[PDB]
Amino acid sequence: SHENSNSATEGSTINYTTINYYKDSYAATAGKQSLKQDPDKFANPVKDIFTEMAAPLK
Amino acid sequence: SHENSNSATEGSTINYTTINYYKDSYAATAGKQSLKQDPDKFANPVKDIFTEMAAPLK
Amino acid sequence: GFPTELKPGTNQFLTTDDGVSAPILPNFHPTPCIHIPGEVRNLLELCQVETILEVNNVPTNATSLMERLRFPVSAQAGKGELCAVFRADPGRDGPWQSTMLGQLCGYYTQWSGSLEVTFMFTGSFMATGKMLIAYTPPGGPLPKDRATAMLGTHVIWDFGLQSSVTLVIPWISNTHYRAHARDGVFDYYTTGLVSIWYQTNYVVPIGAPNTAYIIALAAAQKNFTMKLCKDTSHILQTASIQ
Amino acid sequence: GFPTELKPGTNQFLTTDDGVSAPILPNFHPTPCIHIPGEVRNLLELCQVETILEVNNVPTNATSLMERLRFPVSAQAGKGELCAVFRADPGRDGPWQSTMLGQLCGYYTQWSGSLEVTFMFTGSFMATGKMLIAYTPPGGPLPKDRATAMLGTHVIWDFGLQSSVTLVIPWISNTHYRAHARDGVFDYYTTGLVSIWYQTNYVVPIGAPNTAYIIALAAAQKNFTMKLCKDTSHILQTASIQ
Amino acid sequence: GFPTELKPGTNQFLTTDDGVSAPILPNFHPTPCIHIPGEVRNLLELCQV
Amino acid sequence: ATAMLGTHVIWDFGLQSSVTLVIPWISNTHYRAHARDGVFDYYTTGLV
Amino acid sequence: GDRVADVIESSIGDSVSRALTQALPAPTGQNTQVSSHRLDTGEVPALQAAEIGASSNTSDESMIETRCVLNSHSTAETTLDSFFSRAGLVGEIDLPLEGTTNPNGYANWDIDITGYAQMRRKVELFTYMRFDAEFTFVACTPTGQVVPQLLQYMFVPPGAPKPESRESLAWQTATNPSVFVKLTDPPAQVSVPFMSPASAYQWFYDGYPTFGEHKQEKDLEYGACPNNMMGTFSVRTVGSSKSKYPLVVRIYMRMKHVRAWIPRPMRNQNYLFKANPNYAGNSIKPTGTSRSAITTL
Amino acid sequence: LLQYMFVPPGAPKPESRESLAWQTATNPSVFVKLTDPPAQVSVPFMSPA
Amino acid sequence: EIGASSNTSDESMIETRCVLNSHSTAETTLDSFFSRAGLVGEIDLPLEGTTNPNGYANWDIDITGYAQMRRKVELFTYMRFDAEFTFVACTPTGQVVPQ
Amino acid sequence: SDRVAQLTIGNSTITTQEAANIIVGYGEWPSYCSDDDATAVDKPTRPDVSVNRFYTLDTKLWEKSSKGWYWKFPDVLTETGVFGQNAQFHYLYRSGFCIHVQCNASKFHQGALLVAILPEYVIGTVAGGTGTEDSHPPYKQTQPGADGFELQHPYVLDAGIPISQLTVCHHQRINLRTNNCATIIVPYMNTLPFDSALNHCNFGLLVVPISPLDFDQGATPVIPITITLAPMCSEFAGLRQAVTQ
Ligand SMILES: CCCCCCCCCCCCC/C=C/[C@H](O)[C@H](N)CO
Ligand SMILES: CCCCCCCCCCCCC/C=C/[C@H](O)[C@H](N)CO
């Protein structure tokens, strides 16, 4: 399908599989997102990472 | 697609990618124009072209 | 004229139907995206942050609404007394309603995986003590003594240099997913109780104050999973906005 | 009978929907095209031509409407005086409204890139002078002295053999695109000011006239870009044509 | 605008028509199945008792 | 709030009980002499 | 080139975002390993410090005696596209016959999704969003009846002259996108791209858009972000004379290709105004519910 | 014109016709008239068991 | 006085920074400017009157009858285009009748 | 090896022996904008060591009946130093931050604090008590300056959002049993690469006492809280005259 590439995702690490019947890519369906998580961003945002086997403050 | 070639573009340097469901090519969609500009036609229409590093009238 | 045939489901408007729709702006390239920090890619990333659990939801008036975050401990007669108790349902009207897990599992019908409740002691440095934090699987009512509540899953917690313990509530369930429990027939999805008993006492020397406080912080594990997105239950709205 | 299902968006008429429609004339070959000079392929080609900027939009009556293209200079007391000032918004009611950039960015909502304002001196040959043409990024109000207005982006312009200078207005912006500014909340998209101060004076010998004139010509750069095509704002129409 | 033509049998509701219908819950994975004994695969298995 | 703008060191009390404010050699000359009242205030080092 | 040593060995101009995290693929939940009894010294996985700010990293195996479970619960439901792609009511436009609200057969609606409390509470979970849309306009009489009436929707971008009346010359839509529908058909459905000058929308913008001495008259411009004022939605009964059917238009927006940044707490109080986080001063209601004591249920 | 609404177990039921639970921000709803073919959805296996 | 415009780059006037510009110019082309349907004519068919009382009306083909479409197409002198006409018929009160 | 730390940046140094850890905001360090994200065409100035240094703002008084305070950033640094004189002359502005809140007590005092970073903390008022008037906060409450502002209803954070979910953003706790300082490194969080530094405040710092203070008669009765913060990777673009607001 030869179309324009101007959706609100372009330039990301997530690869879609959508259907589209027009020339512009913001009219396409939502599709199947890739399942990539990152718990280390909001839950463990510390500089030195400590092991769970050790007490942190010694 | 075997059809007639009688659109209002034929014989140009712009190559389209359109869809069409009839035998004549003026009923097709607008499509994706090629992006070719020419600023030297309306902005610098002079015979001898001068460099921007040099004053023109010396 | 291609042969076709309209089957039912025609001229309906399903609010959740994913399909191609008609774009209004042709050959339109949007504003390019820049690197903004804090990009979520899932809503299981907001489950694993600890938030304050309103265990002491006794006070009502607006001048003392800040007191509903911590519960007091003090010196007892040394009989193994009871400090606080609360249910472990994150889809019920109670202490779990004011977390990031109680508002993001208000938008879902079923949930799975292990909860965890991280406590924190905010007393003096020269004051120590031990607490028994027992978790009761369902069927068992409110225990009348610490000797009865010891039989469940419990964790003995000593105060000292480190001032936080983590009682992970295990996923003791017959079903793969459980829904939100409430009164009536929906007591089948009850998770249990969490009770806090004085193990020994709260010992304090001369000069340090009598009453200390504990702050409870609840989170989720790495095997937490939600399903069947719904509308939120524990909120209302007055009529005639503006 | 092929199985199908009509989804919503059916039996609508979108004015911008690109699609195949039914042709009325079969096997029709049109008139062949010949080489006509002046073929545009973009509307960014009409942005880069200079057009007269109505800086002196003081007069009103029809007998003096030709005076709104140039602004006068003369001999001062030599105190660093002010000649003219105007805003640098090409989507506002002002001097930029009568350019090729003010009518082709009336048909768009947002614009980007650098502007440039090319002046031209139409005085005598034996008369020289110097002007300071300062550009003020937004936030800064109208300056009260040339010592205050020197702190922005400015260009000192001497008169002589060459009689045109080009103050390119840099794209100093926080956003990638900016919209058309007007009064109220939309002052957030303001571009700034351009002021013209007497650097030294306007010196003239015996026999040559006192008052000269400067013509301002505005254009666009090679990084100009517009977006979000709209209806034009700075025009009206009376009712009952014919 | 693709050329088409509605043939009869249109806007009917046949109770036994097998066809694709519109799903209401997107990206929904159901509860996984476990080994429950006594799985029928035909109704000729209840004839022979 | 005025004295914070120079070179400063915030010092907490605890187990270790000594901090070291090294005064940097902020000077226009290679060597400086001994300052006193009058014209010889040119060789002043500053304040702590 | 460079000859000084405090620049050639410096770090001025570090442009790349030095990230401490690295996103790993996680299609299902995490399994559980077999753990036995452990009675050792020094190695404690149950004692942490909440003063650090990070959360608990206690596995289930390091606290109880576990069993091996091959977990196969999919996490494809809690993603952003499977949470926001559900169309909710964002606005309602009235067109009565004899009244004072809109008695001239047209009504202008400014584009904001913060008019109804059920959609507003979901999108204000985050601070920055970046989405497309699929609008849907369901038109009916106030008694639900469908009448044979023709209607014109018009999207007015910010700047274009609004129509003063029904017979005005701005309705000729030479460049504005317009939708012509009747009422005896399926409802209209368009697709709106990401139309912002910024790189993302923002529902909370702390600050003023103008400069100058902010006094008591100019205080209402606080929090009005002009990267979100997307224009004006306009409707009319397509004709010259007075119509005879009352109309009600309802707007349903669903987001697709959603990216969200910087989460924040969700609101617990009642909403009071549009684009204004005011609340009731006397009626501060707590989040949970109250009981008699803490020792009993 | 009619609106069907699927209320999952837990969500607040509408008290009346003008109630603010009909705004269906996350509930799947079907909007049909009566002058069309009847609505048809596809419900998955929605059980915890 | 030469007649050509300014060729002054931004780098030759101020001290610039390296910017990898990625703003697309696919919006200002001719197909993305004129492919928006505007009202070019209106035909009246009344019952009792003097304009068209015989149930028919003849309209000469010209797109210069309404001021909003006319100002766009008169930006150029010569044009060469196809068209997609669209005829929306209704009562003067907007009602749709079986006619 | 973990209790003690030192922060050296510019010509300033903070040494503390009862620290917990140095949190990093969203796993991203502050940096300079790349050529892809950049919008302007003028070269941005960047003073290296003259603005990336600690500014000790003000001393608060944590009494028994305290409620909380909030400081809007970067409003607090428009009158202090070369940073306060560059943000008055320049138009565009881009910087991370590094916030460090000291609060000390003995081993006989008890209490806790919540140090939070809330991006785009929009102040809302009480709408006249009953919720009828469309009131708006004044200029002396929205941008308070370097002196902060006392919270009137800290349970709803004076913005409608509850306090119990505040820890989804950046939070460290000053618990007077184990630690005495809370250090947060915040990157640049905005939808635009640059921003004006006179109207838009990026994030708001919130210091609220969760667990109250307590002591017996004989200890010293005043416990001060001091905020100390340092911009990091500051950049400015676009010169004009000095305007104050
Ligand atoms: C016929 C055209 C249909 C109208 C299409 C409108 C497109 C506008 C884009 C909608 C995206 C939501 C806009 C969000 C802004 C919020 O209201 C503000 N941040 C708060 O007032
Ligand atoms: C059922 C057939 C529908 C009618 C189709 C009409 C085809 C005519 C082609 C339209 C192209 C525009 C004609 C432009 C001419 C301008 O009015 C004149 N130059 C000025 O009067």
Author numbering:
A (entry chain D), B (entry chain D): 12 to 69
C (entry chain C), D (entry chain C): 1 to 242
E (entry chain C): 1 to 49
F (entry chain C): 147 to 194
G (entry chain A): 1 to 297
H (entry chain A): 150 to 198
I (entry chain A): 51 to 149
J (entry chain B): 10 to 254
Reproduce passages from the article.
To define the binding area of MADAL385 and to understand the possible mechanism underlying resistance and susceptibility to the compound, cryo-EM single particle analysis of MADAL385 bound to the EV-A71_11316 strain was performed. The corresponding three-dimensional (3D) maps were reconstructed at 3.3 and 3.6 Å resolutions, respectively, by applying icosahedral-symmetry averaging and using the images from a Falcon-3 direct electron detector. The atomic models of free and drug-bound EV-A71_11316 superimpose with an overall RMSD value of 0.292 Å, indicating that the incubation with MADAL did not cause any significant conformational change on the viral capsid proteins. In the two atomic models, the pocket factor lipid (sphingosine) has slightly different conformations, but the corresponding cryo-EM densities have similar intensities, suggesting that the drug binding likely induces subtle conformational changes around the pocket region but does not initiate pocket factor release. When the two 3D reconstructions were compared, strong extra densities were identified on the 5-fold vertices of the EV-A71_11316-MADAL385 complex, indicating that MADAL385 binds on the 5-fold vertex. The drug density fills the pore on the 5-fold symmetry axis and is connected to the capsid density. In particular, the intensity of MADAL385 density was highest at the symmetry axis, suggesting that the bound drug molecule occupies the very centric area of the 5-fold vertex. Due to steric hindrance and electrostatic repulsion, these observations suggest that only one molecule of MADAL385 binds on each vertex. Two other residues, VP1_244K and 245Y, with their corresponding side-chains extended towards MADAL385, are also found within the density envelope at the interface between capsid and drug.
Enterovirus A71 (EV-A71) is the virus responsible for most of the severe forms of hand, foot and mouth disease (HFMD) associated with neurological involvement and mortality in young children under the age of 5. EV-A71 has been reported to bind to several cell surface receptors, including scavenger receptor B2 (SCARB2), P-selectin glycoprotein ligand-1 (PSGL1) and heparan sulfate (HS) glycosaminoglycan. Other host factors such as cyclophilin A, annexin II, sialylated glycans, vimentin, nucleolin, fibronectin and prohibitin have also been reported to promote infection, although their importance in viral entry is still less noted. It has been shown that EV-A71 interaction with PSGL1 on leukocytes requires the presence of sulfated tyrosine (Tyr) residues at the N-terminal region of PSGL1 and depends on two highly conserved lysine residues, VP1_244K and VP1_242K, near the 5-fold vertex of the viral capsid. Our data support a model of activity by which a single MADAL385 molecule binds on each of the 5-fold vertices of the EV-A71 capsid, thereby blocking the engagement of the virus with host receptors PSGL1 and/or HS.
